[PDB]
Point group: D2
Chain length 347, copies 4
């Protein structure tokens, strides 16, 4: 099969012809129909995963096949696989744990001490076939097709968990920074579909602000025009928001929006963008605010988002299909910020 792999750090990804794995035990072999590409892949091609080294820190034995956003048809199964048949359309949770550690025993597999992340330190979906270590990490698609589901295994589960960490309910108000972007609109849809909270979205361009409203935001704010903090104080009547979800934060967002927090407000940070949180401790203690990290998600999170998307209660991202061979080009577009919607490869 064809495979686009990270052969040498720095250089561009290399197309190779390698053997097709034979699944044993609980393993499943998927014929890839959709392989999502996100900004994470820019870092990956560099050797890092958010200021790390898939090589030094995550023990990768180059080359590895990228592609952590996976959907496709079951091609073959090991003899321990139960509940799935050749031909089933499935999406795959790539954030897998080994089972024995603390995080795996308490149901936080994605935080496993020895992660098995498909597309990051295990061969991924940038190929005609990919091996799924255990069939339990799959979800049968009935409403969505591969292209629509694949991005959900990453952006879907990520914003789903962030909304959860926002501890929302009908009595609260949520601020989504960058609400007009791909991640942002996903967050808005998920918040509206599951919390009942009042949703405020803020973005910089007009199209974005428009998109956030379409996604279901109760209030939208163009930071280019009005003062975000002033508008939030107006809308919340000076209380502030009970939660902020800052998707792919920056030095900017982190220096601004924490000021919008209401007492007991939670500032949920997502993404690996290199920035530092500077903040006056006494402020944190007086207001009982909280800064909380969030990355990808667990089996429960995956189950939840897939259930929402298959229910139609949440809508597929704007995607742009491309060829397996255009992998580098797709990553370049993200590295240059010229990417249309979510780019998905079709082997």
């Amino acid at each position: 099969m064809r495979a686009v792999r990270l052969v040498e750090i720095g250089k561009p990804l290399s197309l190779q012809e390698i053997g097709v794995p034979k699944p044993k035990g609980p393993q499943v072999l998927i014929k890839v129909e959709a392989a999502g590409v996100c900004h994470s892949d820019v870092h990956m091609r560099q050797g890092r995963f958010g200021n790390l080294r898939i090589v030094e820190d995550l023990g990768v034995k180059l080359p590895v096949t990228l592609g952590h956003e996976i959907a496709g048809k079951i091609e073959e199964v090991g003899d321990e696989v139960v509940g799935y048949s050749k031909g089933d359309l499935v999406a795959v949770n790539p954030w897998q744990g080994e089972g024995n550690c603390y995080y795996c025993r308490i149901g936080e597999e994605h935080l496993c001490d020895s992660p098995r992340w498909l597309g990051i330190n295990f061969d991924g979906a940038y190929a005609e076939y990919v091996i799924v270590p255990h069939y339990k990490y799959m979800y049968k698609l009935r409403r969505l097709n591969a292209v629509e589901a694949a991005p959900l295994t990453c952006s879907g589960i990520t914003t789903y968990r962030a909304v959860r960490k926002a501890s929302l309910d009908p009595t609260k108000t949520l601020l989504v920074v960058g609400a007009g972007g791909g991640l942002g609109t996903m967050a808005v849809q998920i918040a509206k579909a599951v919390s009942g909270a009042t949703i405020i979205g803020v973005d910089v361009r007009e199209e974005a602000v428009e998109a956030a409203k379409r996604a279901g935001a109760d209030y939208v704010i163009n930071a280019s025009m009005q003062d975000p903090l002033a508008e939030i104080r107006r809308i919340t009547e000076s209380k502030g928001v009970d939660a902020v979800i800052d998707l792919n934060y920056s030095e900017k967002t982190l220096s601004v929006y924490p000021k919008a927090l209401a007492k007991q407000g939670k500032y949920v940070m997502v993404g690996l963008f290199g920035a530092d949180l500077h903040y006056h401790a006494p402020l944190i203690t007086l207001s009982e605010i909280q800064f909380v990290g969030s990355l990808v998600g667990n089996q429960s999170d995956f189950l939840g988002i897939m259930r929402l998307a298959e229910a139609g209660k949440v809508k597929p991202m704007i995607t742009k299909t491309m060829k397996l061979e255009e992998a580098n080009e797709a990553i370049d577009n993200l590295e240059n910020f010229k990417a249309i919607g979510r780019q998905v490869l079709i082997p």
Copy 2:
């Protein structure tokens, strides 16, 4: 009656002879038997409450009578008071709310938009009598005497809530910074009495380290000798602690102990000590750690700690009784760090 009050910011507290209030409605009049003094009172005499102004920010109309740590005998009751009689020994929750705001409706009275904090922006226990706005904020003492209960209305409820915000359970490990101090040993006792978690205490002097163990710490660390972080990694087998409770933190503690955090670990900050939290955002997101503020506590917290202390399940602080007239002297001792145990005035 005699009252020691904050007449003029900066100057020392002034002894005055003023009228004894007559309780109406749900109000209760207490004859003060114990008036605790804590570092908070140092700031108070300065006009601030953790980088604030009881004058400008908290609307105080000087003079105010200090004393937010209150225990005593019921002297008289308004005609709406139910369930308490003249002569009852009670401790008092000073962190009162008005009832109508968000925080009051959700049971977080202490975070009320228009707080009624006895001893801070309402006359307190530095007097022979003090008025309690509503009888619901009291707890009848049966096992403890005034001197033993008074500190619990502040240090007791404060560490009780911090332990709660640490989200502990038997499968987790907790690090208490400054575990040998007054607050610190309180935290250790409360953690051991209610969480089942493994408790690690760290302090700087040997007596302190000894005190933390007596308080019930499973492990104690003298940071003066060994490397705290190395020892924690050993004890936790490299996982890190699931929670840190940093009582009266500093630039030091905040720059050191967050490194001991395990994934999903919570760093609970308490106290108003002027310092800033500097930390690399990507680290927060990868590890899903959380920085959480905590100040005083609510009716549930007060109820919980009082119930623990009256049960003997938690022990009274080391106290040092003094006279109402030695108020300034008592605050000076704290301002100079020469204070023995918790100083309590006895009008």
Copy 3:
């Protein structure tokens, strides 16, 4: 003013001309614009409140003015009232606590040891004016008018809390029994607006089944035609529902629907309909199911539902306005089951 009151148990309610109360302290005087009537009022006119005696058990000193569903204009305020002015349109939470007991201290006011329930053991809204003990129990209306808000202080807060006790999330499925009735459709709307869960509604007539779907049910079942349990097993693929909310249950519902429960499923019982729960203990233990009671709700619940209704995220019940003088007639209609929608009196 005119007042329709319970003068003598058994007999019909009596119209009287009595004095208008003068609010003192935190009290508020409301000019009633909407006084809802629900089946609860049938029992009330009998002397009971769900197999009780407002007389013997709830200490009523007949006569009492009924009307626990209250909305109206502020006519006057005591001198302690803050944040509301003469003329404001408000809805009122009648399930008030005294403040001092366990339930009041932990934020469950409605379960207070010495309840102050307006319209049940305190004079209610069946009059031109009604006194609200404390202004904190109000919510300013901006979108809804009195008639639309009044029912929410009872059916709204009740189903809101039941949905909460159902512990729903996107990964779960909820069964609402009687989903076509007034309460039922309220439950469906609230579930859809705040949980993200898949919602299954079951009712007996076709109009009802239709109404449940309009309310937003994902699946509806006419028990008159198909087998409820078979259909649920189909829809849930044999798992069963994670929660059932049985509004105004009966011997029937209780003997049928608990069979639809999935493991760890919660059966939420609402209403005072006289029936007994019979069930095989071993079944409960093997499946870890739970039977949970729920009645009215607390300040947080009230806040949540009012916030949803004012947001439009939940819609007003079908109401039928009547005159204060038609009180008995309105209760008769419920006692005979000929009542149109929710009947609201307009003094």
Copy 4:
């Protein structure tokens, strides 16, 4: 190896000489050093597991080797096993799931749709060796020896989870029925070690009542002498208990103790004893009480109890060691109620 197995329902267990399994993949082979026997084994020898049929309902292919309480030395490992070596002393969690179903994905493995329960529908510890499907279900012993740990894999995890379902905290009071028995004292120790709640134990004989106090109960009640309900009302000052944990309940306990429940109280039912819960629905709704089932527990529960026992924070049951050959005799003793403490076989 020797194995005592359920060859034919009804008849007594049969000693056989069968092959020793060879572990592959993540499997581990344990040399059994302790095989606990509990009342569950009485039902097992009958063909049922709490009104079921390991044959018809749980798909057993007789014969099966009993023994769901397992501790021992690692004899051999499959080539996928990580983190354990030949010779390690471990205890084993027998309540295993397959991974793919709802319950497995949300971290409730023990409620798996296709359970793998060692000693019940998979060969167990009544033998010289037993195969553990996956190494993640183990816990390395350092403080406890096999005999002390083995019972914890059942009675330990069971009461640990029940205490959890009791939702206790310092402000609450817990009633443990049968507090003097083996399970009962385990519950008391766990409650005291992890909740901070006031603990009331009730039992029938004096020795038992004495044992409950030793286990750490704050209050004990001999139902043979005093009226349980009267005493509870006294102790709780008429509030009632916030939770009851009824271990191996009966028609008796279920008809009595639910009356001790305080509002919002949880009645936690454990065990498969054949009885029905009869209770007046209106009572449940007015008081918001809850009836909750509980059986065994999950990986988190197992982790928690093992962590408590290895910490010494909870003490080993009173055990009585016997020989693998005395299996039937041991089950007979339980079937006749003449068993000393917890009987453990030593192959």
